[PDB]
Write a protein that binds this ligand. Sequence first.
Ligand SMILES: [Zn+2]
Lengths: 309, 75
Amino acid sequence: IKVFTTVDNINLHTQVVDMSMTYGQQFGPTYLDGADVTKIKPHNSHEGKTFYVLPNDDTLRVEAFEYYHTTDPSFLGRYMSALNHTKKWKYPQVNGLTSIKWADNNCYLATALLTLQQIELKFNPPALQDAYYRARAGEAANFCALILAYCNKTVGELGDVRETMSYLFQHANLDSCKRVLNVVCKTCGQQQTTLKGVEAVMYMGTLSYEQFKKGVQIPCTCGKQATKYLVQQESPFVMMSAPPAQYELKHGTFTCASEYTGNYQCGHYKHITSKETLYCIDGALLTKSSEYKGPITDVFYKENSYTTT
Amino acid sequence: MQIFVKTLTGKTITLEVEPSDTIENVKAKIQDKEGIPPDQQRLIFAGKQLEDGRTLSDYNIQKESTLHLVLRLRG
Ligand SMILES: [Zn+2]
């Protein structure tokens, strides 16, 4: 029979497979839209379908690198294994954003996706561009499976939003992003630091962007207490993170935020978005309020250019 | 050289390190002194996350510097 093999679902390679032998005997590990077909023999119904295989020659290796920007040998098996589950999730539109109904501990992925849909970000790998476009259109199975694969997280595993965003930012073009900080010690003087890319958009220790602009107290190695403050920011967003703590979200002062209810061992994420009012998205669920107080872990802010006075 | 690590509970730990030590070895020493597994540890310096492959010298960590130890979330 005639079948097609692929690594990118764009460039197809015609193969003739013997229906008396398994796919595994002919191609190595083989997937049909996420389903493991290694141990299955070709069915009549398979004729003309596209199958994913592993990158087992130089041509496929090049195609895979150009599409995914990874050479992890296990990346495609992990992607397919994720997709086999994520294709069965539901992706309702909630307040105009693609969310994910609860399944398989996917609250962190739902929050990540909701956040991504509210900040200006361009992916570098074609795979992420394409899947994100479809996910925004409401078909997010491929996007979520790619997120899982890139982050080396299996379906069902407890996830952290901050870590996931860090990983995703690694695969985004944020190089132009720049952050200049100053640390002032009354004994030692002033020290500027410049950060580029991911380190320019992420901070762990306070949720408040305003406080970071005004100054946070940190130890100096001389033993005094120095003040660290933000001198300059060039980025389309910033992410301020801290261990989950009760925090009031005020309409109009932030883009979106993550809420974590639970503990270090066990917990749940919700998403808060600042629109005409504050909306709390919990998978398929949506509520609204004029104010917000809860255990916030991550806050996202709009940015373009900031220079300290 | 010595460094300090401030925990979520506010406890300050003292570690004997070298600038050539990787972050993985720092997490190993933290596990030796506290039991917190290296998989759960996330080390922060002046608000930036430190990655396991790089060394203390790569992040410009001098003597008596203070890191913060936070934990990964399980959402
Ligand atoms: Zn000083």
